[PDB]
Ligand binder design. Structure first.
Ligand code: CL
Length: 803
């Protein structure tokens, strides 16, 4: 096979009391070391440490130095092949050794890297020893990084003449024109390395298949010389008749098969999935995909997967992006680093647009051990790795050169911004460059005079991302009519799932004794906005392409506004908690961004008789009538408004994008009946007063999963009363017992202020719920999860795994 899974049969040990510098030596004694499979994050397995050098920013989880070793033989089927060791990502500052000799060192923690080991392996079934030193000396990060070989590891095995790494570039030049003529013009550039010791003549055959595997196009290149140790470049054009475009609703991808021909014989075969799509950022009209105008309904996403830490998992990342798509999201910003290949696969298959972002710093460091100290020597390598990895991916629309980069106020920053966009364009000229810039925010009210160096950087990129800068959206468009503006980072409102504090108080960067934030859209950072305010500023302007809220999902670390407030260890920014459980604001975004009628009530209905409860309805319906125990508490409605260019939206006469009642509490059932303009019912939602806690209820998101050792079932554990109603403030400890053909990969409840382990077999409910993550093994069979709590009845669920 051309690519081999190399994740199995590793050994791992943290450096704690004594130096592991000798672990580079083949003869080093690792018989005491832990045996594991990658991917692996060593930080997520550790207890929280309030004295951690990671601090609150890194979620109080230690990093430090760790070593991996693998002892292996080479199969005889690999003799005379080119062999490379491919890491998708190691966090961070790794040094790799084979048979006691350094292959190299790799500072950056979020790019793939590769070492040719063809001439370094012992063949003849002799033992080889790989040793990887991982140096995550802290503090290295403003968010939870994780530590170790947290992404997949592979061998690439080819004949001496082969398609290079990232050796194809498939494009659809002038697709808008071609498509109106019922075709896609397909430009294919192919790089062939000759790693033999003598020149060859080589041709490239390019065959395009549809998703059913039907051939749709074919082209054979002219012959070209490839001298020994050099790359030959080919460029070929073909046509797909009546092409299927890649779009959000139909994320259709073709497959290019590249055959490398020498003397008519195939010496290499290489596959490239791609999509045909075109898009535009317009200074006046905003964004459009395949000629359809739309706003970017965007979220920022960090790379951790909650209770899995950084350790990549295709199903976990697909689940996060499915939940974002359910919220009405059409676009993601990879804040603030290249994403995993599993994340790319998910956005390509789900139909989501992606901004890929290289850097959280250039040379000026944000944290002592971050990439800043490497930047001046490695930035060209790392930015080109990101672009070269992702240039064929239809989901990727833009390349961000950085986020909130201090250097952009300096002439040094101007020169760096020119270098980064030049280096990107040497790989890919088909996508706009961008940056996320916060330093024009100024006083949040008036149009900020732009720093001269920021202004020259805004002229250097194709598309200007503003962070937290609503006051400039109109002014910069008027003063710079050719700029394409969007919100690269917005809101940073803070909220805890199921917490309904200070209901009539709108507070900025305020801490409470409960270590929580309120889900009335009424807690947000001093630089930020409510969800509503950041949305209104965008909604109202056609020229503004859209926005990427901070954030879609909670992540580990950055527990703002609880800066020094252990056990506050994970974020409040997410629309959805680390466990995948939506907060109320998830339904606010649905109400603004989706067409399918919905209505969502908050808060819960467990209060004290007589107390006036602030009741909200998030809804895209014209009106809602609220009922308590079957009796009307009154109709609330929107005006059917239009933006300046006639786009319809719903807002009250007082400017609200939600509906509101004040209800004297009476136990029972509160019901929201959503109606169209005519009074016809189009959606309903209810909340019931819960009784005493009685049982643990388990629900699997997927009852059947693959017995491949990596597929997951996400099990919701709820605390319910004797009628099955979720107890909305329940915090009961749930003990999980797993039996069968699987393992408990993690537990979570999304509570930012919990220092319960993620790697454990018990978890407290938070606001009624907890999560258990069940992983398959390689033998098919049944997995049974039993969940108990003191004084309650137990819950049980069976998962089937298929081989
Ligand atoms: Cl593509």
């Amino acid at each position: 096979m051309r690519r081999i899974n190399f994740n199995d049969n590793w050994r791992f040990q943290r450096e704690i009391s004594t130096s592991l510098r000798e672990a580079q030596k083949p003869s080093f004694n690792d018989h005491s070391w832990r045996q594991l499979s990658l991917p692996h994050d060593w930080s997520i397995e550790l207890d929280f440490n309030k004295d951690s050098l990671a601090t609150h920013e890194g979620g109080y989880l230690d990093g430090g130095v760790g070593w991996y070793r693998k002892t292996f033989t080479v199969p005889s089927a690999m003799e005379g092949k080119r062999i490379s060791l491919d890491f998708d990502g190691v966090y961070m500052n790794s040094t790799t050794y084979l048979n006691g000799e350094e292959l190299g060192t790799y500072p950056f923690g979020y790019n793939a890297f590769s070492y040719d080991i063809t001439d370094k392996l012992f063949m003849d079934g002799r033992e080889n020893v790989l040793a990887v030193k991982v140096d995550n000396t802290q503090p290295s990060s403003r968010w939870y990084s994780g530590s170790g070989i947290y992404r997949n590891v592979y061998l690439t095995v080819t004949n001496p003449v082969h398609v290079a790494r990232y050796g194809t570039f498939v494009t659809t030049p002038d697709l808008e024109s071609a498509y109106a003529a019922r075709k896609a013009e397909v430009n294919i550039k192919t790089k062939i390395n000759n790693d033999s010791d003598a020149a060859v003549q080589v041709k490239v055959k390019s065959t395009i298949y549809d998703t059913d595997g039907k051939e749709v196009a074919s082209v054979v290149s002219q012959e070209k010389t490839a001298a020994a140790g050099t790359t030959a470049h080919f460029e070929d054009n073909t046509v797909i008749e009546n092409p299927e475009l890649w779009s959000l609703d139909n994320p259709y991808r073709y497959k290019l098969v590249t055959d490398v021909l020498i003397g008519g014989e195939t010496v290499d075969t290489y596959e490239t999935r791609f999509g045909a799509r075109f898009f535009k950022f317009d200074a006046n009209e905003g964004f459009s995909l395949n000629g359809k105008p739309m706003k970017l309904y965007g979220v920022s996403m960090h790379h951790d997967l909650g209770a899995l830490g950084a350790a990549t998992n295709a199903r976990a990342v697909e689940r996060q992006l499915q939940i974002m798509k359910d919220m009405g999201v059409n676009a993601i910003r990879g804040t603030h680093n290249p994403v995993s290949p599993e994340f790319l696969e998910a956005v390509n298959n789900l139909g989501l647009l992606l901004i890929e972002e290289a850097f959280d710093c250039w040379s000026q460091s944000k944290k002592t051990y971050d990439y800043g100290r490497f930047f001046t020597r490695w930035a060209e390598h790392d930015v080109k790795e990101m672009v070269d990895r992702g240039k064929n991916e239809p989901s990727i629309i833009m390349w961000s050169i950085g986020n909130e980069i201090y250097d952009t106020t300096s002439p040094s920053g101007v020169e760096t911004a020119r270098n980064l966009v030049r280096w990107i364009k040497e790989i890919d000229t088909t996508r706009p460059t961008t940056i996320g810039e916060d330093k024009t925010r100024g006083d949040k009210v008036n149009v900020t005079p732009i720093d001269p160096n920021i202004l020259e950087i805004f002229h250097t990129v194709d598309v200007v991302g503003l962070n937290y800068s609503e006051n400039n959206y109109v002014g910069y468009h008027e003063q710079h009519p050719n700029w394409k503006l969007y919100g690269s980072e917005t809101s940073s409102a803070t909220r805890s799932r199921g917490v309904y504090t200070h209901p009539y108080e709108y507070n900025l960067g305020t801490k409470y004794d409960d270590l929580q934030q309120s889900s009335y859209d009424n807690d947000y950072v001093p630089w930020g906005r409510t969800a509503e305010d950041a949305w209104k500023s965008d909604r109202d302007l056609k020229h503004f392409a859209g926005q990427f809220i901070w954030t879609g999902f909670d992540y580990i670390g950055e527990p703002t506004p609880y800066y020094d407030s252990y056990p506050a260890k994970s974020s409040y920014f997410g629309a959805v908690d680390t466990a995948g459980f939506p907060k109320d604001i998830f339904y606010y975004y649905q109400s603004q961004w989706k067409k399918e009628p919905m209505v969502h009530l908050l808060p819960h209905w467990n209060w004290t008789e007589g107390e006036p409860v602030r009741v909200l309805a998030y809804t895209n319906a014209h009106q809602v009538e609220l009922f308590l125990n079957g009796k009307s508490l009154g109709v609330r409605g929107y005006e059917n408004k239009k933006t300046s260019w006639g786009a319809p939206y719903k807002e009250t006469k007082d400017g609200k994008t939600y509906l509101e009642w004040a209800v004297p509490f009476k136990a029972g059932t509160l019901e929201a009946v959503a109606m169209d303009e005519n009074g016809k019912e189009i959606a309903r939602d209810q909340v019931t007063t819960a009784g005493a806690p009685a049982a643990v209820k388990l629900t699997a998101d997927r009852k059947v999963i693959k017995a491949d050792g990596t597929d997951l079932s996400f099990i919701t554990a709820e605390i319910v009363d004797s009628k099955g109603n979720v107890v909305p403030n329940a915090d009961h400890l749930i003990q999980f017992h797993l039996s069968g053909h699987g393992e408990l990969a993690g537990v979570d409840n999304g509570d930012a202020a919990s220092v319960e382990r993620y790697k454990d077999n018990k978890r407290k409910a938070f606001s009624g719920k907890a999560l258990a993550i069940v992983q398959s093994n390689k033998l098919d069979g049944n997995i049974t999860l039993h969940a108990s709590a003191e004084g309650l009845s137990s819950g049980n669920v069976t998962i089937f795994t298929t081989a």
